[PDB]
């Protein structure tokens, strides 16, 4: 998923750079530098967010392990609730008949 996100971000940055290069001569140069520095700020934001994502990518295993631990403990928790329900249902419904 990080590969697809990186490829999509690269394609979007390339399309935006091509659109800025096409619209650079249309816009006035003083405002064109403002647009270029704004787009460069955008590309720096994309690059640092991809940097944060790939800084997370090494830590995916701990998140997956904690998720598996949570699922196991919830599974057991559900069973305890189920046993109580089984006890309540058998003690209150089957017995009366």
């Amino acid at each position: 998923r990080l590969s697809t996100l990186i490829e999509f971000l690269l394609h979007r940055a390339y399309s935006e750079l091509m659109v800025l290069t096409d619209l650079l001569p249309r816009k006035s140069d003083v405002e064109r530098k403002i647009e270029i520095v704004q787009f460069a700020s955008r590309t720096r934001q994309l690059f640092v967010r991809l940097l944060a994502l790939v800084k997370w990518a090494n830590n995916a295993g701990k998140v997956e392990k904690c998720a598996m631990i949570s699922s196991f403990l919830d599974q057991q928790a559900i069973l305890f609730v189920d046993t109580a329900d089984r006890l309540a249902s058998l003690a209150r419904d089957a017995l009366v008949h």
Binding site: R12, T21, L24, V30, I36, Q45, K62, K65
Partner: protein, 75 residues
């Protein structure tokens, strides 16, 4: 004599909740180093936007003209 239809008791060493599997897979030491963001931005003052616009866009995901822009944009 013997008890009716008695069944086999389960194993002694099996998966339970009271066991600490974080110590089993050795992740508690990472927790020790962990035990930033708003903590880092909160420890400093205590002791003493474009991001929201670009969030959905990144959530979804000539040379002569450039030279002329570089030459004329210096004003």
């Amino acid at each position: 004599g013997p008890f009716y239809l008695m069944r086999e008791l389960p194993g002694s060493t099996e998966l339970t909740g009271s066991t600490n599997l974080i110590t089993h897979y050795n992740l508690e030491q990472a927790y020790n180093k962990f035990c930033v963001k708003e903590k880092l931005s909160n420890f400093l003052p205590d002791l003493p936007l474009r991001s929201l616009i670009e969030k959905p866009p990144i959530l979804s995901s000539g040379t002569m003209l450039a030279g002329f822009r570089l030459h004329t944009g210096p004003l």
